[PDB]
């Protein structure tokens, strides 16, 4: 749509009068535009870091050109598949590729990272190595993938305002993972059989490998302290996990916000402007290093036109020009409100709309307060007045209850006496019109301006309709030609009426917004309200609409789902090793990753936003993957060899180091930017980035010396008696 408008406009430009230009206030398009492109930059660039890590470990050109050209193949094919699946390109469907680039560098590493050894076994054979390495690996790849699936898919299975938000990650990754296998059984094998094949340098790892291979096994021996350690690191999470608050999506600086300025009902257009200026000025002067434009509009009600409301589309600079959170919409719009609420006799205020939250997390509750019987406006006002009152006495918990500007304002009745009227020969009709034409406009019919049919209205010159005493100017030809005046068939009397009538679902209503601010739970507030909404006089009902419709509706338990995932992560695993027992060797890693994540997320100022589950499953899962290959090599370097007890674990954890250390470092250094990002779309970057990096390092080493124990702890403790 925006391409069009802007291009429609175009056709215009060439023809308007002289000095008439289209400026561009608050537009939301370019953020989105820049945003999902500031993400592309990531992928594009992180395929670079990966190319370098795949060097400090492999030290060749064309032997590097192979694993680094895997993710770009896979990813491209994901976009195709996305399209097939009638999906789109957007943040979620992108980070999903980001969080998935791990799952690609690795599956490529793993392969060539293997035909890399076995080249240390056969002297000099390429096709033999690559092929030999396959087979004793191929059925392994097909299984991880057939298992990670489940670490993703059982989300994006609970639906809701949300649900579809996760289904985006889910799909993008469940596939693009699959393509990783097709590349794996097609591109990576060959090609790595086509172009495959410092004493204080190279020697770094290798010297430090045995020292690893040593430290292992010997562990948990003449001090069982280690198998305890887990129940510690575990009891580690669970704590911190309930301490870390949850959130849907992190609000972001789009580069634009707007400012309400609703005065109280009955204000004057001329005053409303006053307020509006000043708001227009404050921004102009003070935060001028940010505020780049201010399209001050007055009379424009967001919930209906009005002489007493208005709006201010404020528009910032390029972000780039605004370093540090002080120059972020949140802060800019923090002080911006402190300054108002001051020198301003009206309820002015600014704020940044919550991205992707067409109602999802607008924090609080709509509580429509309906008139369930033939009650009336007045009564109902009151019944709200009470419900409103109590609301105040319970501030114990965090609240801020209130209505929407339907405050009764003075009306001026004028009661026409049909008798005196027909008494004096006047008709009611002639009067009616006179009333309702001088003082309420009227459109006769359609003149034509410059070949563009336009409207025609008869009404009183302002100056003859501004105070009740003017209703004394109009007289009205009777049937005797005698001009008679209103004060002769009428009489007026001030009173109170309402400038706004709600209704909700056919019954008259009155919206009461409000929240349970930092402290209590959004389900207590409601409970409470429902509680004291059952006092109020007979006839008064209530109901939820909006964020609260969706609260009592759309929360399809995650653990309830994530369990069905355990069952499937296991049945798969077992499925794979044929053992109702071996698989616990790997599942057990789960914690070693989320341990890092549930940290950093606490260290940095972060939440349980999405982008945390995605980087929580990408590790939770990936982690369980490097663990397969280090529990797979046993039961094998054991069941199909001259080795056993620890002899199994031996070259297993020994051969699972170069890979791990490579991938883990391939991914991490790759997610670098994300973590501390510039500022445009940062919100989402930073949150992805801190959750992963600090959840990777925490489960790379802190697992490398840890799966081994598991495996043994596992089956050795199954052959006990």
């Amino acid at each position: 749509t925006a391409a069009a408008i802007r291009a429609e406009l175009a056709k215009m430009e060439p023809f308007f009068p002289s000095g008439l230009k289209i400026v561009y206030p608050y537009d939301t398009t370019p953020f989105v535009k820049i945003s999902i492109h500031e993400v592309v930059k990531t992928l594009v660039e992180a395929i670079i870091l990966v190319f370098l890590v795949m060097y400090l470990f492999l030290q060749n050109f064309r032997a590097t050109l192979i694993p680094t050209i895997a993710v770009p193949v896979v990813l491209l094919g994901t976009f195709a598949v996305l399209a097939a699946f009638g999906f789109s390109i957007n943040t979620l469907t992108m980070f999903g590729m980001v969080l998935a680039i791990g799952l690609l560098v690795d599956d490529a590493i793993v392969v060539v990272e293997n035909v890399e050894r076995v080249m240390a076994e056969e002297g000099l054979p390429p096709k033999e190595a690559t092929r030999k390495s396959m087979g004793q690996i191929q059925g392994a790849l097909v299984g991880i993938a057939m298992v990670l699936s489940a670490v993703f898919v059982p989300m994006a299975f609970f639906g809701g305002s949300t649900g579809a938000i996760y289904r985006q990650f889910s799909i993008t990754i469940v596939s693009a993972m699959a393509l990783s296998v097709l590349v794996a059984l097609i591109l990576t094998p060959a090609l790595c059989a086509t172009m495959l094949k410092f004493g204080w340098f190279n020697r770094m790892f290798e010297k430090s490998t045995h020292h690893y291979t040593d430290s292992v096994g010997g562990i948990l021996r003449s001090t069982g302290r280690y198998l305890v350690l887990y129940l510690i690191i575990v009891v580690g999470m669970a704590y911190l996990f309930v301490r870390l608050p949850s959130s849907f999506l992190p609000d972001e600086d789009q580069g634009v916000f707007m400012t309400m300025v609703q005065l109280p009902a009955g204000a004057t257009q001329e005053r409303t402007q006053k307020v509006l200026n000043e708001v227009t000025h404050y921004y102009l002067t003070k935060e001028k290093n940010n505020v780049e434009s201010v399209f001050a509009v007055n009379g424009f009600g967001f919930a209906g036109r009005g002489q007493n409301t208005g709006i201010a589309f404020v528009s910032l600079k390029d972000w780039a020009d605004r370093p540090g959170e002080e120059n972020k919409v949140e802060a800019i719009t923090m002080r911006a409100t402190r300054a108002f609420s001051q020198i301003k006799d009206a309820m002015v205020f600014a704020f940044n709309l919550p991205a992707i939250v067409e109602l999802g997390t607008a924090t609080g509750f709509d509580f429509e307060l309906i008139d369930q019987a033939g009650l009336g406006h007045e009564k109902l006002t009151q019944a709200r007045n009470q419900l409103l009152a109590e609301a105040a006495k319970h501030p114990d918990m965090l609240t801020s209850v209130r209505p929407n500007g339907l405050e009764d304002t003075p009306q001026f009745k004028i009661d026409i006496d049909q008798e005196k009227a027909q008494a004096l020969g006047v008709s009611i009709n002639d009067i009616n019109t006179t009333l309702g034409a001088a003082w309420g406009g009227s459109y006769v019919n359609d003149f034509i301006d410059r070949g563009r049919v336009k409207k025609v209205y008869v009404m009183s010159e302002a100056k003859y309709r501004m105070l009740p005493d003017d209703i004394g100017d109009w007289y009205v030809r009777a049937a005797d030609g005698q001009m008679v005046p209103f004060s002769a068939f009428s009489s007026s009397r001030w009173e109170y009426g309402s400038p706004r009538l709600e209704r909700y679902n056919g019954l008259p209503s009155m919206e009461i917004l409000g929240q349970a601010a930092p402290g209590k739970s959004t389900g207590e507030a409601m409970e409470l309200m429902e509680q004291l909404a059952s006092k109020l006089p007979t006839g008064v009902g209530y109901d939820w609409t909006g964020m609260s419709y969706q609260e009592r509706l759309s929360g399809n338990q995650a653990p309830s789902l994530y369990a069905i995932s355990l069952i499937v992560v296991f049945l798969c695993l077992a499925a794979l090793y044929e053992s109702w027992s071996i698989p616990f060797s790997v599942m057990l890693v789960v914690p070693l990753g989320v341990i890092g994540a549930l940290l950093a997320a606490t260290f940095r100022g972060l939440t349980n936003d999405v982008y945390f589950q995605v980087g929580l499953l990408t590790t939770i899962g990936l982690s369980a993957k490097n663990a397969i290959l280090i529990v797979e090599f046993a039961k094998d370097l054991m069941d199909k060899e001259g080795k056993g007890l620890i002899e199994a674990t031996l070259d297993a954890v020994r051969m699972r180091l170069r890979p791990i250390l490579m991938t883990s470092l391939a991914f991490i250094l790759g997610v670098m930017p994300l973590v501390i990002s510039t500022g445009a779309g940062s919100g989402a970057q930073n949150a992805v980035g801190t959750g992963v990096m600090g959840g990777m390092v925490t489960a790379t080493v802190l697992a490398i010396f840890f799966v081994p124990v598991f495996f043994v702890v596992v089956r050795r403790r199954f052959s006990r008696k």
């Binding site: 749509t1 002289s18 008439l20 230009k21 561009y24 206030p25 608050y26 537009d27 939301t28 398009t29 989105v32 050209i69 491209l76 094919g77 976009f79 195709a80 399209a83 789109s88 390109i89 957007n90 979620l92 690559t130 092929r131 396959m134 305002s161 097609i186 591109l187 060959a190 059989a193 424009f300 209906g304 009005g306 067409e358 009709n429 002639d430 309420g440 009227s442 459109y443 301006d449 336009k454 209205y457 008869v458 009183s460 010159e461 100017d473 109009w474 007289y475 009205v476 030809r477 030609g481 009426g497 309402s498 706004r500 009538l501 709600e502 209704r503 909700y504 209503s509 609409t545 419709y549």
Partner: protein
Amino acid sequence: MPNFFIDRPIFAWVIAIIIMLAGGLAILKLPVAQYPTIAPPAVTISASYPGADAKTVQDTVTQVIEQNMNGIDNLMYMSSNSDSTGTVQITLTFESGTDADIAQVQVQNKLQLAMPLLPQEVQQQGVSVEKSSSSFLMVVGVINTDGTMTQEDISDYVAANMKDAISRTSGVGDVQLFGSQYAMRIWMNPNELNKFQLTPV
């Protein structure tokens, strides 16, 4: 298995490529919309009664229209709400997944039943039914450098000459105009009407 391509490559060195093109194509055309859609469709009839007034707008139009709303598939709620600025807006939030086209249609079948009851002044006024998000897509500033025209001259302009199309265009669900198109305005005067013995009638 891998074997195949291991010996005979240049056959996997093409899959990759084709596969890659598939993503090239599929990118030139994949919708880069903001983020997925999650917002339940909403239609909002919205009439208007010149200088009318709240209780008047609403006992006389809004109750009328609402009563008439039924037989509407997937409909979470509706919520009239209408100002005494002689003006109304009634907005129905249909489920999620609901085909906007059809509700928008749906709704329109009902309301058309009431057209015949509204007061003439609301008919002629224009009455309308819509299918859009409430938040604003974008804003289009129109300024005048020479100061060769005024606020009132620009609201016109714009109207004559630019809404029209805006208003008309796939995508442009609803254009508000931040002013007003011109109109022969007959600012009367009573003393006179009085002198010569005339009335606005």
